[PDB]
From a paper:
The HA1 subunit is primarily responsible for binding the virus to cellular receptor sialic acid, while the HA2 subunit mediates subsequent fusion between the viral envelope and the host cellular endosomal membrane.
From the antigen side, we chose an HA1 fragment between residue D55 and E271 (F55–271) largely due to its short length while maintaining the strongest binding to the three mAbs. We first expressed F55–271 and determined its crystal structure at a resolution of 1.5 Å. The F55–271 fragment showed the same three-dimensional fold as that of the A/Anhui/1/05 HA ectodomain 41 with an overall root mean square deviation of 0.92 Å for the 213 Cα pairs. We then went further to generate the complexes of F55–271 with the Fab of 65C6, AVFluIgG03 or 100F4 and determined their structures at a resolution of 3.0, 3.05 and 2.8 Å, respectively.
Author numbering: 47 to 68, 74 to 264
The structure:
Amino acid sequence: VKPLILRDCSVAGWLLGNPMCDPEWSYIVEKANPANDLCYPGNFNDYEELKHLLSRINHFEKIQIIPKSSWSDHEASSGVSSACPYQGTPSFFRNVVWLIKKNNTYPTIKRSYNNTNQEDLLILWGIHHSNDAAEQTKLYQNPTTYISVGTSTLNQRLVPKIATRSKVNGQSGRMDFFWTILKPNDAINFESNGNFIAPEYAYKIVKKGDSAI
Ligand SMILES: *[C@@H]1O[C@H](CO)[C@@H](O)[C@H](O)[C@H]1NC(C)=O
Ligand SMILES: *[C@@H]1O[C@H](CO)[C@@H](O)[C@H](O)[C@H]1NC(C)=O
């Protein structure tokens, strides 16, 4: 088990799986000025807090918590962007899922994940802010949407801000990302009818000082 030494990628970029960045590690090292952060424009919530938390971790393990194959009623591989290319073609963050309507329908999602592991889990998700009613319809069908997220300590409801915006890295849309630490035997619960960038992979983390000798 070796340290994870990020070359061209930020902490946020690696966690989310920025495709422009070329299973188990100890601590993480991030360079001073990584070229690749968030390829798609937007915000990473409480980023300073996450970086400090992650600097205190010396065991990481990436686990699949919501398999991409489990989205039977939503497209899970159709959402890509020229902001996030791979080998010259539009791509997307690899560790979260851009869910898109399927057959002109976006059923309301209810998904829970229960932390059956012995370690704390870092889980990330996001929201896509669309540019106008037409784009909203095209991608998600439903005009008025939300993402609700709950744990034993988190109670969040995200609502897209649908508005015309300047193009940043070619995109008028924005994506904001959020995270939490899910304690053992706690569960995270999602309900959404659109604009949801869903977790696929999460990270088991152990703080320095918490391991057996
Ligand atoms: C798509 O939705 C329509 C409307 O309900 C339905 O009639 C049709 O069978 C659906 N097609 C597929 C392939 O699910
Ligand atoms: C997680 O699963 C365990 C085992 O089934 C259960 O006892 C516990 O209530 C679940 N946690 C939550 C928050 O539902």
